[PDB]
């Protein structure tokens, strides 16, 4: 459950 950006990937 990290606070990473779930939409970081441009592809």
């Amino acid at each position: 459950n990290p606070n990473a950006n779930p939409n970081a990937n441009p592809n």
Partner: antibody, heavy 117, light 113 residues
Framework: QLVKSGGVKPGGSLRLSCAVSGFTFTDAWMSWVRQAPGKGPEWVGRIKSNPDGGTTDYAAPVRGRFTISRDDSKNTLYLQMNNLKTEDTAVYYC????????????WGQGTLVTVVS | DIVMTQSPLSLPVTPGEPASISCRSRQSLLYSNGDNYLDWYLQKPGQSPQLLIYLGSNRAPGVPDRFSGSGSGTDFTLKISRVEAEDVGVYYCMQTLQTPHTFGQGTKLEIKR
């Protein structure tokens, strides 16, 4: 496309502005990173997009002194630096993830902040 | 914090020869959607860092095919199939899974001309 501007003594303040061009800033999460001379980069803080809550996270050495904000009207990211320390001296960069991965390239020129006493 | 460890710290390589750099994390960088939240950078002398690989294995635009990124979870590898003179600089890993975002200590590549 990023252009950093606005970059000074111990205890004083300085505001960095990073005007963004080349993608839709409103939907981009943004980070400040810095690199003191002779050392590797160090993450300073991040601000989510306002549609995702627009909340902020800060590196421990700057928590309580620095404030990150954004004006989506101007496609501009800000770093308000207060109560500056000499150890804050570094080149500061504004970065993002998805739009940067898509375009490639470097972090740009960055702006040197020298805390002088 | 997530400590990132890079190996080796210094990497002398003869032009044309292959180079491999390792970055190891204490915490898995695998996110719930299958992506690994690790980027690879090159900082050429006097320049700002340049993105080489994003999210584990995606070669960024403008990067020659000589560069490739592999790995998953806690162990990642940047590979340079053939080293050129322009490749000299300091290579950095960077995890973005969890704040504070953190960087490897850096790997200085040295061209053995």
């Amino acid at each position: 496309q990023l252009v950093k501007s606005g970059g000074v003594k111990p205890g004083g303040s300085l505001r960095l502005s990073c005007a963004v061009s080349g993608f839709t800033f409103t939907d981009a999460w943004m980070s400040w990173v810095r690199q003191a001379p002779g050392k590797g980069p160090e993450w300073v803080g991040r601000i989510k997009s306002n549609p995702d809550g627009g909340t902020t996270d800060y590196a421990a050495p700057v928590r309580g002194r620095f404030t990150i904000s954004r004006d989506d009207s101007k496609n501009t990211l800000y770093l308000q630096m207060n109560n500056l320390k000499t150890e804050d001296t570094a080149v500061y960069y504004c970065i993002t993830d998805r739009d940067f991965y898509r375009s490639g390239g470097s972090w740009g020129q960055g702006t040197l902040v020298t805390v002088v006493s | 914090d997530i400590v990132m460890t890079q190996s080796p710290l210094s990497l002398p390589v003869t032009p044309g020869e292959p180079a491999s750099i390792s970055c190891r994390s204490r915490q898995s960088l695998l996110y719930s959607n299958g992506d690994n939240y690790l980027d690879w950078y090159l900082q050429k002398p006097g320049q700002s860092p340049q993105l080489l690989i994003y999210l584990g294995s995606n070669r960024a635009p403008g990067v020659p095919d000589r560069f490739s990124g592999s790995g998953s979870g806690t162990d990642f590898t940047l590979k340079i199939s053939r080293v050129e003179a322009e490749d000299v600089g300091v290579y950095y890993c960077m995890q973005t899974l969890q704040t504070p975002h953190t960087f490897g200590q850096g790997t200085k590549l040295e061209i053995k001309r």
